[PDB]
Design a protein around this motif. Structure first.
Motif, short mmCIF file in Angstrom:
data_model
loop_
_atom_site.label_atom_id
_atom_site.label_comp_id
_atom_site.label_asym_id
_atom_site.label_seq_id
_atom_site.Cartn_x
_atom_site.Cartn_y
_atom_site.Cartn_z
N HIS A 1 0.80 -1.22 0.00
CA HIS A 1 0.00 0.00 0.00
C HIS A 1 0.84 1.27 0.00
O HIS A 1 0.44 2.27 -0.61
CB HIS A 1 -0.94 0.01 1.21
N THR A 2 2.00 1.26 0.66
CA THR A 2 2.85 2.44 0.69
C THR A 2 3.53 2.68 -0.65
O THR A 2 3.76 3.83 -1.03
CB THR A 2 3.90 2.32 1.80
N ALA A 3 3.86 1.60 -1.38
CA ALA A 3 4.48 1.76 -2.69
C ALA A 3 3.47 2.29 -3.71
O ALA A 3 3.82 3.12 -4.56
CB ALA A 3 5.07 0.43 -3.16
N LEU B 1 0.91 4.18 -2.88
CA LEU B 1 0.70 5.57 -2.48
C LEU B 1 1.85 6.46 -2.96
O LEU B 1 1.63 7.59 -3.40
CB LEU B 1 0.55 5.66 -0.96
N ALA B 2 3.09 5.94 -2.91
CA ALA B 2 4.24 6.68 -3.42
C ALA B 2 4.17 6.84 -4.93
O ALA B 2 4.51 7.91 -5.46
CB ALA B 2 5.54 5.98 -3.02
N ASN C 1 1.52 9.48 -5.62
CA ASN C 1 2.10 10.80 -5.36
C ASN C 1 3.08 11.21 -6.46
O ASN C 1 3.16 12.39 -6.80
CB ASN C 1 2.79 10.81 -4.00
N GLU D 1 -7.90 9.50 2.62
CA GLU D 1 -6.61 9.47 3.27
C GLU D 1 -6.58 8.44 4.40
O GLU D 1 -7.61 7.87 4.78
CB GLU D 1 -6.25 10.85 3.82
N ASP D 2 -5.39 8.21 4.94
CA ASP D 2 -5.19 7.22 5.99
C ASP D 2 -5.69 7.76 7.33
O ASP D 2 -6.06 8.93 7.47
CB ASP D 2 -3.72 6.83 6.09
N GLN E 1 -0.75 3.12 15.00
CA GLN E 1 -0.16 3.02 13.67
C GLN E 1 -0.94 3.92 12.72
O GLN E 1 -1.90 4.59 13.12
CB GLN E 1 -0.16 1.56 13.18
N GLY F 1 -2.98 3.48 9.22
CA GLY F 1 -3.50 2.53 8.27
C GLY F 1 -4.65 3.13 7.48
O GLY F 1 -5.34 4.04 7.93
N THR F 2 -4.84 2.59 6.28
CA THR F 2 -5.89 3.08 5.40
C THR F 2 -7.26 2.63 5.88
O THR F 2 -7.40 1.62 6.57
CB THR F 2 -5.65 2.61 3.96
#
Ligand SMILES: CCCCCCCCCCCCCCCCCCCC(=O)O[C@H](COC(=O)CCCCCCCCCCCCCC)COP(=O)(O)OCCN
Ligand SMILES: CCCCCCCCCCCCCCCCCCCC(=O)O[C@H](COC(=O)CCCCCCCCCCCCCC)COP(=O)(O)OCCN
Ligand SMILES: CCCCCCCCCCCCCCCCCCCC(=O)O[C@H](COC(=O)CCCCCCCCCCCCCC)COP(=O)(O)OCCN
Ligand SMILES: CCCCCCCCCCCCCCCCCCCC(=O)O[C@H](COC(=O)CCCCCCCCCCCCCC)COP(=O)(O)OCCN
Ligand SMILES: CCCCCCCCCCCCCCCCCCCC(=O)O[C@H](COC(=O)CCCCCCCCCCCCCC)COP(=O)(O)OCCN
Ligand SMILES: CCCCCCCCCCCCCCCCCCCC(=O)O[C@H](COC(=O)CCCCCCCCCCCCCC)COP(=O)(O)OCCN
Ligand SMILES: CC1(C)S[C@H]([C@@H](C=O)NC(=O)[C@H](N)c2ccccc2)N[C@H]1C(=O)O
Lengths: 1040, 100, 50, 100, 50
Positions: free
Chosen positions: A688-690, A692-693, A696, A719-720, A807, A809-810
């Motif tokens: 999920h972070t990749a 999102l990157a 962006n 957004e998260d 944490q 999280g989405t």
């Protein structure tokens, strides 16, 4: 046909009577709605699974459902959406020309075997299979101010819902709210004091609350000597909260067993407590009455209002129905406008025919011919399985001048022959019919060849164009058949014999008008004779006008349907993450107090906990419904100005959160304003972070190194949010007496709800739900560990094993075609087409690594196709009109002379809309005219009428050359003969579209968009044709 | 690996074509196979049902809920969703499944 | 009032529904079941397996 | 385990009230005895095929399958588009064995 | 409040009550229109309807 139907007037009169009766039978058997079947078959599931996040719900049900929804005949694409509420939706969009019922039952038959491997929690609530394409008729609101939401919902479900869906026309009534249920508010402190838990409470609620099937005495394998047979009834199910408060949980050895009224709280309540609806600050329920296919909408709303008045005669103290929004009133104003323009067109045709033809017996002819053509068009509508809506009535408005033009040009030639030769009307009508029969046949064939490829497109625009084509072509064919058969009989029998010399020797007001018209005709003939000498300069200025018309048409913005006022503005309030319902309700009360200070807004509907951009505890929406169109006749009274003032007040007053006020557009399936949506998918399933990157990176590449209007491009998802994840250490649990199922049952009983069984509540059956205690679950500190597998075992809480930490999280998971995706938004900012923007974003997603793809969704799928559907069909229609004219004139060069009036209507319409945009830009708001559907169909009608006038001039000029005349002489006599009926039908059309030019009120933007288009097109096309068509005939006769 | 990549990226992509009725992948997708020695179960006095109960009790999705739900008291401000993994996805985690 | 009217002959005009029969009604007393020590699962299994 | 009151009120009532909106339907007739067996009879207009009506009944039936009780979801709702009259009665006779 | 309804053949027999006069009028106006079309007179088919 023309020689046969003049000596037999009754043979045409009975055909007109049959067409009238077929039109009446078609009108009495047509469905009434406001918008046609534009959409594709879409299937929505709406699975329910309470007490779960987005990723758990996704990996539980969505990946299992979406992996088996493949192989269905006609599937276009699929998407799944989930949030942290506990409800996920699978939208399966199919291809056009596909039956929606077979697709829905195929999704049901697939889900019947998908449901076998689903968990047991989603099988209790059930996963329905519904369709997204539904109608919309009325909204019924009920306010009481003394009761709650659940009591009014129960009263509506018991006394209003079963009485509204029983009348004829109503398809499906959908409530907006949760039903009644038996909530058991359990306190865990009493459970840990009495050494109980939640599993024994659920087992008791499943055990004592149950149905018994006792059978019957004297069954079929009986003995010899039995006479009496009786059944046994044993009702052992609880239906009262006082009976539910005495549920035995555990019996002691001496007595005083544990009940449910001392360790819990049993009472009636709602099912989820998620959504709420308010109307001007009071408690209000919700009912969306949806119409069915092949039904009426005008009488159905009146029957619903009569049933609501009958129910209001038996309402209790406080409750009163109120309908804030109705779509059935959208179609009566359109029929009233159709009748109004028909009456005004009859009045102006009578006035023009009394001014020109100087009698009253000529004027009776079109007033009979036109309504039989309208009824024949209605019969051809009802034969093809269409319905009555706004587009059909607008097409019936646009076809008014075409069905009167052939009525005018026939009786004009009849009166001209009767005034010139002095013949009786029989031989004069025979001569006029033998003159213009092939001409009107070629006009009809050209109009059919123009209106046929409009109904050959694919998509939403094809479904819009099909109604206009199937109405206008049928009306043209019926008016042509009437002008062939019935109109020669009306000119032969009803007309009086013209008197030689004494007629056309007026005294009074007309003689001056006749002398002025003769002087104007002589001046026009002198101007044509002055034009017909310098052919080269006129040809090059016509070429310059054509290329500047193409240049003005190419520099126009694109659209499909312009936005218009409907009577309500949709607002949305989005609070930041980590917000409860009290701040949402406070911001909605502030929104209501802001909306009450505007005199244009009449009512305000407030919905908390539900929005179109994602459902949550912080999202909210609202509908500010305005007043009637009569009291809003000003400048700052439309919905755009009200939305702008509401945005300006929300940006100044609403501190908590942000709220935008945008106007609702036309039909959602046609997303005018979506721009360019990008669904950035991943193939290797990185995380999920990749993703999102990467999203962006695409946003930064489209903002800083892009032209996609960088102020408005943003992520169109969610957004998260901060979360409270845990890490259960298995090494500490294996070295102690801590199992794994006890922590699962403890967390699912404390932080979520549970559904155990049902209970009867006055006939119907409702649910029984246990939510423990609400106050206990407020702080993040959770200390409930228990259940050592040999005893009670209170050893350690969930502090060393859980390791609770925050944490990020989405709270939303969207998958597209099996792979997860992220929603984007583009914009063609400054005069740039989407055909290069799609290649730009394709290169932007191709320059990354292997494993990241894209998928255009929504409106961009139709713009992704090539441009071979407009230009090729237009060229085929143009060459087919060319071949029809070659069949008519028995030549090859004169069809090229007729085909030179085609850029004139485009140039006139483009210059008219450009002048209107530059006039409204300096004295008003932003220009809202573009190259939409209405401009295109107005250009089509002015092209057809200019081609009709050109065919009439060319047919009048061609027959005059065989009597020993040249090209310029025959063109001059043709212009002198055809100066009158062209200016007659031009005056009729312009005076008919003058109320269409300055129309204001309901659906006025489309009326203006058709009116100014046909007005400027007809004006410039006539004023250029009457000086250029003899020039074209001359330069073709000599050129070839 | 190619049979697992075909089932997840090749098979569901070419079976949405109008005309394709069946895509029979000659092979199998990825699964977690546990090969049990029956001579070791007689020493520790275990059976296959104990292994099945230990795999069904220790490998399940834990759906906890949320902090500060919608039927709340007046005064709640912060809402946070609780997410518990509680699941196994690797072989070295499945090697440490507690039997007794 | 439909019979013996001259238009409808007798002994043929009957109802088209099943007539009501006397049935057995069991009322479970949960107070005596709690005082004597019998749960609801025993009576349910007895009535469903008799 | 239901009488003629709750069976027609909880099972047949929602089906009868949500079966409206289907085109061609002239009248409805539901019947429920004391043995717990319902029978909804939907009569349509003549001149109309059963191919579309038989799938629209299943489309309007699956929406109310979730509000139905859990007992009738296991047995399901059987759809039988057969006639009510009799065509032939085949009688089998034998004097060497019983009728079972 | 106590309304009746029919079933089977009785529904068709109740529906076929107003169809007769409308069918006769439609056949009469059809014969009138056809004989006015063919023989080209309004007074000719009025003597045929008698
Ligand atoms: C409704 C029933 C209407 C039937 C009309 C019958 C007319 C028969 C007239 C016989 C005749 O010689 O007329 C020809 C027309 O026939 C035809 O055009 C063919 C008619 C066939 C039915 C359409 C002359 O034809 P024309 O060439 O003089 O005039 C056509 C302009 N193009
Ligand atoms: C040309 C003359 C008509 C022009 C177009 C009128 C369109 C009317 C459609 C809208 C409408 O529904 O009004 C109808 C009234 O007209 C009628 O009942 C028949 C209209 C007769 C027009 C008169 C022309 C005679 C020459 C009722 O139609 P409905 O669908 O509401 O029917 C009700 C069954 N519940
Ligand atoms: C499908 C593609 C077919 C394209 C045909 C389109 C023709 C459009 C104009 C037709 C037309 O003007 O017919 C007039 C009458 O001719 C006729 O008699 C024919 C009338 C239209 C077609 C009828 C069937 C013809 C055989 C096919 C020509 O007038 P004219 O001066 O040639 O004289 C004719 C005798 N009055
Ligand atoms: C407008 C849409 C596109 C139309 C495309 C065709 C336009 C042709 C315009 C001129 C045609 C033409 O004048 O041909 C005449 C006859 O030709 C002939 O003998 C054969 C016919 C020529 C045109 C054929 C068009 C078929 C299109 C099919 C698709 C010349 O005749 P002429 O003997 O006067 O030559 C003069 C030598 N000084
Ligand atoms: C429609 C219902 C009404 C039918 C009335 C038909 C009226 C025909 C009148 C008539 O006598 O025309 C005959 C020919 O008609 C024709 O050839 C064309 C018109 C008749 C055919 C179209 C009518 C049927 C309806 C089509 C839809 C000429 O006959 P004649 O007396 O000159 O005899 C010649 C012996 N050598
Ligand atoms: C109802 C039917 C009544 C029709 C009465 C017909 C009139 C009889 C009559 O003597 O007057 C005619 C004129 O009719 C007329 O001029 C008007 C007659 C209008 C008939 C309209 C029928 C509409 C039917 C629609 C049903 C749906 C005669 O005159 P003639 O020209 O026949 O001469 C015949 C040669 N002496
Ligand atoms: C014309 C519309 C846009 S309005 C209406 C909507 N109505 C609401 O959302 C209710 N407030 C609501 C929804 C969900 C839960 C509670 C309350 N149906 C649409 C349509 O028929 O297409």
């Amino acid at each position: 046909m023309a020689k046969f139907f003049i000596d037999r007037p009754i043979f045409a009169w009975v055909i007109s009577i049959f067409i009238i009766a077929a039109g009446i039978f078609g009108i009495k058997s047509l469905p009434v709605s406001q918008y046609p079947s534009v959409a594709a078959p879409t299937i929505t599931l709406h699975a329910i699974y309470p007490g779960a996040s987005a990723q758990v719900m996704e990996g539980s049900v969505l990946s299992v459902i979406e992996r088996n929804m493949n192989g269905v005949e006609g599937l276009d694409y699929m998407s799944t959406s989930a949030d942290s509420s506990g409800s996920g939706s699978v939208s399966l969009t199919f291809t056009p020309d596909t039956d929606e019922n077979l697709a829905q039952v195929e999704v049901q038959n697939k889900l019947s075997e998908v449901l076998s491997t689903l968990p047991a929690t989603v099988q209790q609530y059930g996963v329905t299979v519904s369709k997204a394409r539904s109608n919309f008729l009325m909204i019924v609101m009920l306010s009481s101010d003394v009761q709650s939401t659940e009591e009014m919902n129960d009263y509506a479900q018991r006394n209003v819902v079963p009485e509204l869906q029983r009348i004829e026309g109503v398809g499906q009534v959908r409530l907006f709210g949760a039903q009644r249920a038996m909530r058991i508010w359990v306190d865990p402190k009493k459970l840990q004091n009495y050494n109980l838990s939640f599993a024994d409470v659920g087992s008791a609620l499943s055990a004592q609350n149950i149905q018994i099937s006792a059978g019957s005495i004297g069954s079929l394998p009986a003995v010899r000597g039995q006479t009496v047979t009786a059944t046994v009834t044993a009702q052992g199910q609880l239906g009262t909260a006082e009976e539910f408060g005495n549920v035995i949980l555990r019996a002691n050895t001496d007595g005083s067993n544990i009940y449910l009224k001392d360790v819990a709280k049993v009472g009636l309540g709602m099912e989820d407590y998620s959504s709420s609806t308010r109307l001007n600050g009071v408690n209000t329920t919700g009912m969306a009455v949806m119409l069915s296919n092949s039904g009426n909408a005008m009488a159905t709303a009146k029957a619903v209002k009569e049933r609501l008045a009958v129910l209001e005669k038996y309402f209790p103290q406080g409750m009163s129905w109120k309908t804030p929004y109705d779509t059935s009133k959208f179609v009566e104003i359109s029929i009233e406008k159709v009748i109004h323009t028909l009456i005004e067109a009859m009045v102006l045709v009578f006035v023009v025919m009394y001014l020109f033809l100087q009698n009253i017996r000529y004027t009776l002819i079109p007033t009979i011919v036109v309504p039989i053509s309208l009824l024949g068009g209605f019969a051809f509508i009802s034969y093809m399985g269409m319905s009555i809506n706004v587009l059909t009535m607008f097409a019936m408005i646009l076809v008014i001048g075409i069905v009167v033009d052939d009525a005018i040009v026939v009786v004009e030639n009849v009166e001209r022959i009767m005034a010139g030769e002095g013949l009786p009307p029989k031989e004069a009508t025979k001569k006029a019919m033998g003159q213009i029969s092939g001409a009107v046949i070629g006009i009809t064939a050209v109009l059919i060849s123009v209106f046929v490829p409009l109904a050959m497109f694919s998509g939403a625009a094809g479904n819009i164009y099909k109604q206009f084509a199937l109405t206008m072509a049928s009306s043209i064919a019926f008016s042509a058949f009437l002008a062939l058969t019935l109109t020669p009989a009306l000119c032969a029998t009803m007309l009086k014999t013209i008197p030689k010399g004494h007629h056309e020797e007026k005294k009074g007001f007309f003689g001056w008008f006749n002398k002025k018209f003769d002087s104007w005709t002589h001046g026009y003939e002198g101007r044509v004779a002055k034009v017909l000498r310098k052919t080269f300069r006129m040809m090059v200025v016509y070429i310059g006008l054509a290329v500047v018309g193409v240049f003005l048409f190419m520099r126009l913005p694109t659209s499909f349907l312009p936005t218009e006022d409907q009577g309500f503005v949709m607002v949305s309030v989005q609070l930041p993450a980590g917000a409860t319902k009290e701040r949402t309700d406070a911001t909605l009360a502030q929104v209501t107090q802001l909306a009450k200070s505007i005199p244009e807004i009449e009512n305000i509907i407030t919905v908390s906990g539900f929005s179109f951009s994602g459902s949550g505890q912080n999202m909210a929406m609202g509908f500010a419904i305005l007043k009637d169109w009569n009291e809003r006749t000003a400048s700052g009274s439309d919905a755009v100005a009200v939305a702008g003032k509401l945005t300006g007040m929300m940006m100044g007053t609403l501190k908590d959160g942000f709220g935008i006020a945008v106007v609702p557009p036309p039909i959602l399936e046609l997303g005018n304003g979506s721009g360019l949506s990008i669904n950035l998918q991943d193939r290797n399933n990185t995380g999920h972070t990749a993703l999102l990157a990467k999203r962006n990176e695409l946003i930064q590449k489209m903002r800083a190194s892009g032209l996609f209007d960088p102020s408005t491009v943003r992520a169109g998802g969610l957004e998260d949010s901060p979360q409270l994840k845990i890490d259960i250490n298995r090494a500490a649990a294996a070295a102690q007496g801590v199992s794994f199922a006890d922590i699962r049952t403890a967390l699912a009983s404390a932080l979520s709800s549970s559904y155990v069984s049902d209970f009867p509540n006055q006939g119907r059956l409702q649910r029984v739900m246990v939510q423990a205690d609400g106050d206990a679950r407020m702080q993040p500190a959770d200390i409930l560990n228990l259940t050592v597998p040999n005893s009670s075992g209170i050893a350690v809480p969930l502090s060393s094993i859980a390791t609770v930490s925050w944490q990020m999280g989405t709270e939303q998971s969207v998958r597209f075609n099996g792979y997860p995706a992220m929603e984007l938004s583009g914009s063609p900012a400054t005069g740039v087409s989407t055909g290069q923007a799609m290649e730009a974003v394709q290169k932007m997603v191709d320059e990354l690594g292997s494993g990241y793809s894209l998928e255009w969704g929504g409106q961009s799928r139709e713009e992704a196709k090539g441009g071979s559907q407009t230009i090729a069909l237009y060229a085929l229609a143009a060459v087919a009109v060319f071949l029809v004219l070659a069949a008519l004139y028995e030549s090859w060069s004169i069809p090229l002379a007729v085909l030179l009036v085609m850029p004139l209507g485009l140039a006139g319409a483009a210059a008219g809309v450009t002048g209107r945009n530059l006039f409204e830009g300096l004295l008003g708001s932003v220009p809202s005219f573009a190259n939409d559907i209405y401009f295109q169909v107005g250009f089509v009608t002015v092209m057809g009428l200019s081609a009709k006038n050109a065919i009439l001039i060319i047919e009048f000029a061609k027959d005059l050359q065989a009597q020993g005349k040249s090209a310029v002489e025959a063109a001059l006599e043709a212009a002198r003969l055809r100066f009158r009926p062209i200016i007659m039908t031009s005056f009729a059309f312009i005076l008919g579209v003058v109320p269409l030019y300055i129309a204001g009120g309901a659906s006025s933007a489309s009326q203006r968009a058709i009116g100014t288009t046909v007005f400027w097109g007809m004006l410039i096309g006539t004023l250029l044709s009457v000086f250029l068509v003899p020039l074209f005939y001359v330069v073709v006769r000599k050129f070839f």
